[PDB]
């Protein structure tokens, strides 16, 4: 099977580009399992709700980080590892890169703390490829106003999230493809068409 993750803000066309990529796989042999984090199983989605619902009790950062990883542990067991087991391609909206970006970059938790949970929860399992939908934050912020606890975050939070994805990509370039989601969809999908050979390769 193949484990592909998609990262970036929702105003970035992630969803429509995921559908584009899923169509290209299904018109070939390929089983596609679409999924998203936090969530993807009934229990993971209950955890999602705790994470996204605003509250008058401020959630501790260590709490947010641990809930993200709890949902991930359930999701890996309920959905991701089985998919991969039967040779499917998983197209997962957000994964541990998002933890580095939102909880590490956004919240300022130490990368070491995130890296330690990543190893505990996932073992050696990492995405085979990660698509970063990169977008200047003003566009991201406009699109969020036009459209939860994260949507309501400030400018400096979102700047940290964007640049953390870009740093993560730069450190392990064989695992990432950065896409300029400020381009019109046609040129973004052209870019996806260009990755498909490699993706089918893996
Ligand atoms: C999967 N994931 C994570 O590990 N850390 C995360 N922080 C924020 C989001 C998220 C979820 C919904 C809307 C916006 C951001 C998702 C995250
Ligand atoms: Mg804040």
Curated annotation (Swiss-Prot):
InterPro entries: P-loop_NTPase, Thymidylate_kin-like_dom, Thymidylate_kinase. GO terms for cellular component: cytoplasm; cytosol. It catalyses: dTMP + ATP = dTDP + ADP. Signal peptide: none annotated. CDD domains: TMPK. GO terms for molecular function: ATP binding; dTMP kinase activity. It comes from the Bacteria. Its EC number is 2.7.4.9. Keywords: ATP-binding, Kinase, Nucleotide biosynthesis, Nucleotide-binding, Transferase. Pfam families: Thymidylate_kin (PF02223). One of its GO terms (biological process) is dTTP biosynthetic process. ATP binds at residues 8-15. Phosphorylation of dTMP to form dTDP in both de novo and salvage pathways of dTTP synthesis. Belongs to the thymidylate kinase family. This is Thymidylate kinase. The lineage of its organism: Bacteria, Pseudomonadati, Pseudomonadota, Gammaproteobacteria, Pseudomonadales. The gene is tmk.
